Amino acid sequence: LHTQVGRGLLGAVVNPLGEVTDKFAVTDNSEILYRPVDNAPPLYSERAAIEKPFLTGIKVIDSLLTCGEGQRMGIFASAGCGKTFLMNMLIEHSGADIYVIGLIGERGREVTETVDYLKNSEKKSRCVLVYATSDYSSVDRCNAAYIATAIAEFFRTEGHKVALFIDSLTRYARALRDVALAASLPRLLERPGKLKAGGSITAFYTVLLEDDDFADPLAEEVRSILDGHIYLSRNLAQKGQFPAIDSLKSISRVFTQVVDEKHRIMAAAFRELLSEIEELRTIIDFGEYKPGENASQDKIYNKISVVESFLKQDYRLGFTYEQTMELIGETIR
């Protein structure tokens, strides 16, 4: 099985057969080539070490969860936790050369929502969208993930810094299970990375949490395979914190490899402040907080608003690395 690749797909919407069915942008490049959708992962000796940050423009991620070029990062959330808006922010406020989105959704309205977003995005000329809805077979739903990854791999071989999004691994795995009935990952999940001889694919895989923010077996397996995970808390969403990232239950496993020492120090001091705030929140809920009785508790209390203001981010705003580190420094003062 082969699929179209190349710069002529920039601005295009591609179906699970690999054909263009819609456009959210038009470009002057018409390059169309063909590649197999199944390809072995790089050899260990062809991979470069993850050592350069992949900046997202999102304050909490760039400061506490810093991604690296070539990393695979999970995004874990229940329904209604802002996963799609977080992906929109990751596309809009990062600095990749090319974005490849693979939607393994179920209803055509979600695909159309992503198409309309891209139609109004500043990144439209550098995106490719691959989709499969519930109307498509399970074979077609798995193939959409493979097509998206093969397109990203072509741009990586050209030298580009590519961001790949697969939404969602949960529905990919459900379709894979259905296909297995008729008769895989991490073979899919190990295809991203930075190549010594080429560019990089930095990949974000979404995982749905069922019921509360509970990790079914698939979620545990995915978390073990990836280089980190961002957890979106329904509880933080209902309190009105957007992005609803729970940084104390999130991790980038490459963090200390991609930021410098002064950043490490600031991030550790901020995380210690967040933990102190969570303990104080419980003490408040227990009715045991009385102003003036404990000066360290009062100091923590008076940090809550500045901390919340650092974590909060309008989805239309992106922050440079220098701005983010300036702000986190002000917060821990």
User: Experimental method for this entry?
Assistant: X-ray
For residue 75 the two structure tokens come to 């995004």
Is 133 annotated in a binding site? The answer is no
133 three-state secondary structure: coil
Is 84 annotated in a binding site? The answer is yes
Cα separation of 159 and 19, whole Å? Answer: 25
- 308 — alpha (psi -120 to 50), left (phi > 0) or beta? alpha
Beta-carbon contacts of residue 212 (< 8 Å; ≥ 6 apart) = 78, 234
- 226 — alpha (psi -120 to 50), left (phi > 0) or beta? beta
For residue 226 the two structure tokens come to 């990836």
Cα separation of 250 and 75, whole Å? Answer: 9
Cα separation of 50 and 194, whole Å? Answer: 7
* Secondary structure element (H or E) that encloses residue 34, with its range: strand 33-36
* Secondary structure element (H or E) that encloses residue 278, with its range: helix 261-285
Is 85 annotated in a binding site? The answer is yes
This PDB structure is determined at a resolution in Å of: 1.9
Nearest to 312 by CA among 241, 233, 223: 241
How crowded is the C-beta side of 186, counted as CA atoms within 13 Å?
11
Is 81 annotated in a binding site? The answer is yes
Cα separation of 160 and 157, whole Å? Answer: 7
Beta-carbon contacts of residue 160 (< 8 Å; ≥ 6 apart) = 97, 98, 199
For residue 298 the two structure tokens come to 């009062």
Beta-carbon contacts of residue 38 (< 8 Å; ≥ 6 apart) = 1, 146
For residue 104 the two structure tokens come to 């393994």
Is 228 annotated in a binding site? The answer is no
Cα separation of 25 and 117, whole Å? Answer: 12
Is 83 annotated in a binding site? The answer is yes
Beta-carbon contacts of residue 319 (< 8 Å; ≥ 6 apart) = 57, 58, 59, 62, 93, 313, 327
Helix (DSSP H) and strand (DSSP E) numbers for the chain: 11, 14
